[PDB]
């Protein structure tokens, strides 16, 4: 999977979680989101290829993925507790992470 494929996985599985009503469905989708975020986590994106890996911009970009993974992990723990609706609300709050990184990079 490349960056575009990883982002489509994140996009679609957010909606899977919204559509769901049980813990197994939400867990399955969050697990898919976690793998997609981890797949995209380490690559330097094209607009930052000329920046140093420790540059402020690259640091903030990598932190965007690390922080997204952290909150996916937290939502997954809620799903593993059978707390379906709390896990769904946590998943909805992931959208803040998506929009924050997009706004920086675009």
Binding residues for heme b: 7
| Smallest distance, a second copy to C-beta of residue 68, A | 11
Q: Which position among 17, 61, 87, 88 is part of the footprint of ligand HEC (CB under 6 A)?
A: 61
| Smallest distance, a second copy to C-beta of residue 17, A | 16
> What CA–CA distances, in Å, run from 72 to 10, 39, 44, 86?
11, 14, 21, 13
Calpha distance 27→14 (Å, rounded):
12
Contact between 106 and a second copy per CB under 8 A: no
Contact between 53 and ligand HEC per CB under 6 A: no
Contact between 97 and ligand HEC per CB under 6 A: yes
Q: Which position among 23, 35, 69, 98 is part of the footprint of ligand HEC (CB under 6 A)?
A: 98
Q: Which position among 88, 99, 101, 105 is part of the footprint of a second copy (CB under 8 A)?
A: 99
Contact 48, 60 (CB under 8 A): no
**Where along the sequence are the contacts to a second copy (CB under 8 A)?**
90, 93, 96, 99-100, 103
């Amino acid at each position: 999977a490349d960056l575009e494929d990883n982002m489509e996985t994140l996009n679609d599985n957010l909606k899977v979680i919204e559509k769901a009503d049980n813990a197994a469905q939400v867990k399955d989708a969050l697990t898919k989101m976690r793998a997609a975020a981890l797949d995209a986590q380490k690559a330097t994106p094209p607009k930052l290829e000329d920046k140093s890996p420790d540059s402020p911009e690259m640091w903030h970009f990598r932190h965007g993925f690390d922080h997204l993974v952290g909150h996916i992990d937290d939502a997954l723990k809620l799903a593993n507790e059978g707390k379906v609706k709390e896990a769904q609300a946590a998943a909805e709050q992931l959208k803040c992470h998506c929009n924050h990184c997009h706004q920086h990079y675009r």
